[PDB]
Structure 1
Amino acid sequence: GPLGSSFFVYCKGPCHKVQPGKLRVQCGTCRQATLTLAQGPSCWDDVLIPNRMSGECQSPDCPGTRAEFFFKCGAHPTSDKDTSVALNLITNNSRSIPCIACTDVRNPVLVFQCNHRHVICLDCFHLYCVTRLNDRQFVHDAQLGYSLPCVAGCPNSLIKELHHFRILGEEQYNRYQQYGAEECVLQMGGVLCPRPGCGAGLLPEQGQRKVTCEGGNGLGCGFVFCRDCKEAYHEGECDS
């Protein structure tokens, strides 16, 4: 909910891990750090939602007023626009709440946005993300995307800032992105090409049972098949 110096970002290098973050702000128009804020931010929505706060750009040729917040890693000097995504669900365990998985008081921890605000440590959250990813247990929402709910199974606890899944590690994160793109195609009514090695994302018309893997140069393998059996194209008797 509220804010503070307990910011945590994911540094993609040289840290390749979750690190304490620095909150910065730039003018929403000229994209320069010359905008002053008459009041500081009070909640996460103030820094996560665009045009949620106003200020005044101190440039003589810029009347910008929109505050644009961003984050940088705080474990080492960073360039002026070397940003890192902020993990708003990760904060310091000031209440010293034990992990709901390993039953160990750790710091920092991730707090799900369920009704009970369940607490999990980063190590357990990493294992929780990997196992559900390999088991294809991730959930896809047309509004949020490819995410996971609370580890305890609470409703309406899907993680909204999908960059929290950077804890999967570099290899498993690109697999997560790939699985999300695949489930996204299936969500739009499309179908994945059954020919191994191709794995294309095809979006044919809803009525056509004919699927012509075809996009252009290297965009399709040219295999014609049926949406239902996914074996080979036919005119009838979809059974084996």
Structure 2
Amino acid sequence: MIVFVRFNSSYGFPVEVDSDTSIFQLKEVVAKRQGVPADQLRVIFAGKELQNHLTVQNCDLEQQSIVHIVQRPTYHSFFVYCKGPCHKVQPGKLRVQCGTCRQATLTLAQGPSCWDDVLIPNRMSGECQSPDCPGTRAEFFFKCGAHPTSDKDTSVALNLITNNSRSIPCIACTDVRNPVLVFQCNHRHVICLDCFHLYCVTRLNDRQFVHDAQLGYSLPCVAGCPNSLIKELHHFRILGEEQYNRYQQYGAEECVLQMGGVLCPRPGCGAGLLPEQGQRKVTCEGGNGLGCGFVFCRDCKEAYHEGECDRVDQRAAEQARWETTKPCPRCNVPIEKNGGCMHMKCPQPQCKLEWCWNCGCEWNRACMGDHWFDV
């Protein structure tokens, strides 16, 4: 049988296999081809990572399919993308400052309780304590929590990523992982970060991103729900630098195709070619840059020749759906929570304990940063 191999591409190169073919041997063609050990390698298909031991005869793979290869005590409400030194998603620390003097001296009567309170500007107000400062506006920002950071060293919040405190199973793999990305669709479907990586990467390869006419290219819920397009495109940074970069070039790749052009299939080049005629024979001349001089067939994208050329389970998706009082730990007097805010103030004048809903401890700066609120 013939198998189509896609790794960091839109197209697949054909590999001769059969029913008796094992998986490990196939990643090894790629492993030497890419100098990357198969052991830190995965290949998923139609929503399934078929184990080393499964073969084509023990799965739904049929002749001429195409597959994808990738290379592989503290409550955290917030996750950021850290532009460095981390260059990855990390747990974050919430912070607030005076909208006027930009100092960390702004006191809030009530703390924030939802994402809107901290992403929507001018949403909350307080009093600044800084000497001779009348500033009232609350400016929220996030910082990477994986190392010390200057207060000017901010990071974008990945606001669809949630602490998996409810222990909801992943929509695609059915495992309980932490943290998870929860879509803004109707049923609010939950997906773990690994399956979200595989989802985006697969969609990249198949050129299946949705063009939101208003703002850029995105993806919706993996179940295909309506009104679920990701609006905070920084979420795609979970792809990691190379793939995210490839994601940013999506629009530029779209223009290349619409200009009737074809892309050089060589991964070290990947130039956008706009040849004059539509002849099957194509030579890479680099477009505006320098070409690799590859001559290929425009149809199969193989070296130029003379002849011819050669997902989500309902049960899992029902499971993976995201959706009043405690007694004061010091004085044991019941009190009701103000939505998502974790900052609890007991009204009993004798007790007057400020405490964290989640931790049950005295209120403190660590609890503000880690989980001032939760969803």
Query: Which consecutive residues of structure 1, in runs of 5 or more, have no partner in the other structure?
Result: none
Judge which range, 100-109 or 138-147, deviates more: 138-147
SS at match of 1:231: coil
Q: Quote the offset at 1:156 in angstroms.
A: 0.6
Contact 1:225/1:232 (<8 A) preserved: yes
For each residue in 1:203-239, what CA deviation from the matched residue of structure 2 results, as whole angstroms up to 9, or x when unmatched?
9999999999999999999999999999999999999
Aligned to 1:202: 273
Shift in alpha-carbon separation, 1:100–1:193, aligned structure 2, 3 A: closer
Q: CA deviation at 1:196?
A: 15
Q: How far apart in 2 are the matches of 1:17 and 1:27?
A: 29
Q: Which residue of 2 aligns with 1:108?
A: 179
1:23 equivalent in structure 2: 94
- For the residue of structure 1 that corresponds to 2:267, the secondary structure is coil
> Is 2:256–2:273's contact at 8 Å kept on the other side of the alignment?
yes
Q: Is 1:57–2:128 an aligned residue pair?
A: yes
TM-score, normalised via structure 1 length? 0.73
Change (3 A) 1:214 1:45: farther
State how far apart, in whole Å, the 1-side matches of 2:122 and 2:79 are. Answer: 22
> Greater RCO between the two (CA within 8 Å, min separation 6)?
2
Partner of 1:79: 150
SS at structure 1 position matched to 2:282: strand
Q: CA deviation at 1:182?
A: 5.9
Deviation at 1:168, TM superposition (A): 0.9
Call closer, same or farther: CA 1:36–1:228 in 2, change over 3 Å.
farther
The alignment's TM-score, normalised by the length of structure 2, stands at 0.48
Q: Assess if the C-alpha contact under 8 Å between 2:97 and 2:104 holds in 1.
A: yes
For residues 227 and 136 of structure 1, do their structure 2 counterparts lie closer, same or farther at Cα, with a shift above 3 Å needed? closer
* Higher Rg of the two aligned structures: 2
- CA shift for structure 1 position 108: 0.6
Distance 1:216 1:45, change over 3 A: same
Evaluate the alpha carbon distance shift between residue 35 and residue 223 of structure 1 in structure 2; reply closer, same or farther with a 3 A threshold: farther
Shift of 1:29: 2.4
- The residue number in structure 2 matching 1:211 is 282
- Residues 1:36 and 1:218: Cα distance change in structure 2 (over 3 Å): farther
Residues 212/34 of structure 1: CA separation in 2 closer, same or farther (3 Å cut): farther
1:4 Cα shift? 8.6
Between stretches 210-219 and 97-106, larger displacement belongs to: 210-219
Do the aligned partners of residues 22 and 216 (structure 1) sit closer, same or farther apart at CA in structure 2, a change above 3 Å counting? same
Distance 1:156-1:181 versus aligned 2 partners, 3 A rule? farther
Classify the secondary structure of the residue corresponding to 1:86.
Answer: coil
Partner of 1:93: 164
In 2, Cα distance between equivalents of 1:237 and 1:124: 38
Gapped regions of structure 2 (runs ≥ 5): 1-72, 310-373
Quick one: percent identity of the two aligned structures?
Answer: 98
Query: Deviation digits for residues 110-147 of structure 1, max 9, x if unmatched?
Result: 11111111111101101111111122111121334221
Partner of 1:68: 139
Structure 1 residues 211 and 57 mapped into 2: Cα distance closer, same or farther (>3 Å)?
farther
TM superposition shift of 1:13: 2.1
Sort the Cα spacing of 1:125 and 1:96 in 2 relative to 1 into closer, same or farther, 3 A.
same
Check the 8 A contact 1:3/1:41 in 2, yes or no. Answer: no
* 8 A Cα contact 1:193 1:200, kept in partner: yes
Determine if contact 1:3/1:42 at 8 Å carries over to the other structure. Answer: no
CA distance in 1, matches of 2:300, 2:76: 55
Q: Deviations over 1:61-98 (max 9, x none)?
A: 43221111100111221112111111111111122111
* Equivalent residues of 2:77, 2:162 under 8 A apart: yes
Distance 2:93 2:170 in 1: 26
Helix, strand or coil: the match of 1:23? Answer: strand
1:8/1:90 contact within 8 Å kept = yes
Deviations 1:22-54 (A, max 9, x none): 000112222222222222001100001110001
